[PDB]
Each structure stands twice: as structure tokens, then as C-alpha cells.
């Protein structure tokens, strides 16, 4: 699906950031990483919204209160994914500021802690994406 390809581009970019390789460390001190992640996030959410809209052209008819609940649950799962991606962006903005405040000192232990926290944020984003995919897969029925 288009939205899954978009999310995959976000996910591959963030897997690269997770390596904290030399070029990642460079781009993390500019706005480049968080700006490129915002663009990838925005594209994912836009495709998600269009996909839901197109699914609603091919629904199995059910009771109005049942359809309304399923649409609400799907809306909340979309919001969770967007919030996860923002949490990742925000944590990398925080890293930038904490490095500046070190005034040139070693960032090795900042990066160890960032790597650890990024792993947890990414586990959360992955489980929310899998839950959203499952909900979309049964939505039309």
C-alpha cells in the first residue's frame, strides 16, 4: 500500500539514525535529520488519511453505531502513529540541545543513552503500526 511504502521510508531512515554513525552524528547537530523525518512523517499521515477515505468507498454495510465505532478506533490508531513519529522527532531535538549545552565535551554517553531510548521509541512505533495495519485490514467488513 502507498501509506505502507511511505511508512517504510520513515522506518528505513530512522533505522539509519539508530546507527548513530559518523554522518548521522553530523546531521543530528543541524536540523537536517528532524526536518527530513518531519517530511517523511507528513507524507505517511497524508497517505494514511487518503487510504482510509478510499476504503470507505467499498464498505460492507453494517449498523451505523458499529461503523461509527470502527471509524473512531481507526482514527485513534492513526493518531497514535503520528504521535509516535513526533515523539521520535522530539527526542532527537532534545539530543541536539543537550549536545550544545555540553560546550564541546564528549558526547559518547549522551549517544549511548539516546541509542537506548530510540530503540524503545521504535519498538512502540512498530507495535502501533502493526495494530493499525490489522485494523485497516478488517475495517471494510
User: Among the candidate windows 33-41, 51-59, 84-92, 121-129, which touches ligand KJM by CB under 6 A?
Assistant: 121-129
The residue (of 4 and 47) whose beta carbon lies closer to ligand KJM is 4
Q: Which of 54, 87, 98, 130 binds ligand KJM (CB under 6 A)?
A: 130
Question: Does 55 interact with ligand KJM (rule: CB under 6 A)?
Answer: no
Q: Which of 20, 43, 133, 135 binds ligand KJM (CB under 6 A)?
A: 133
Q: Which of 87, 115, 126, 140 binds ligand KJM (CB under 6 A)?
A: 126
d(CA 45, CA 12): 16
d(CA 129, CA 121): 12
In DSSP notation, 56-97 reads TTSPPP--HHHHHHHHHHHHHHHHHHHHHHHHHHHHHHHHHH
Q: Least Å distance between CB 62 and ligand KJM?
A: 24
Give the residue carrying C-alpha cell 487518503.
50
d(CA 96, CA 35): 13
Q: Least Å distance between CB 126 and ligand KJM?
A: 5
Closest CA to 48 of 102, 3, 99, 92: 3
Q: Least Å distance between CB 93 and ligand KJM?
A: 21
- Give the binding site for ligand KJM (CB under 6 A): 4, 7-8, 11, 125-126, 129-130, 133
Amino acid at each position: 500500500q502507498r501509506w505502507e511504502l511511505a511508512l517504510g521510508r520513515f522506518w528505513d531512515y530512522l533505522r539509519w539514525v539508530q546507527t548513530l554513525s559518523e554522518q548521522v552524528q553530523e546531521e543530528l547537530l543541524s536540523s537536517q535529520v528532524t526536518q527530513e523525518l518531519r517530511a517523511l512523517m507528513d507524507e505517511t499521515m497524508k497517505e494514511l488519511k487518503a487510504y482510509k477515505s478510499e476504503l470507505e468507498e467499498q464498505l460492507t454495510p453494517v449498523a451505523e453505531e458499529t461503523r461509527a465505532r470502527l471509524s473512531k478506533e481507526l482514527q485513534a490508531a492513526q493518531a497514535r502513529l503520528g504521535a509516535d513519529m513526533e515523539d521520535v522527532r522530539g527526542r532527537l531535538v532534545q539530543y541536539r540541545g543537550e549536545v550544545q549545552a555540553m560546550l564541546g565535551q564528549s558526547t559518547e554517553e549522551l549517544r549511548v543513552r539516546l541509542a537506548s531510548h530510540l530503540r524503545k521509541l521504535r519498538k512502540r512505533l512498530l507495535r502501533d503500526a502493526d495494530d493499525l495495519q490489522k485494523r485497516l485490514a478488517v475495517y471494510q467488513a
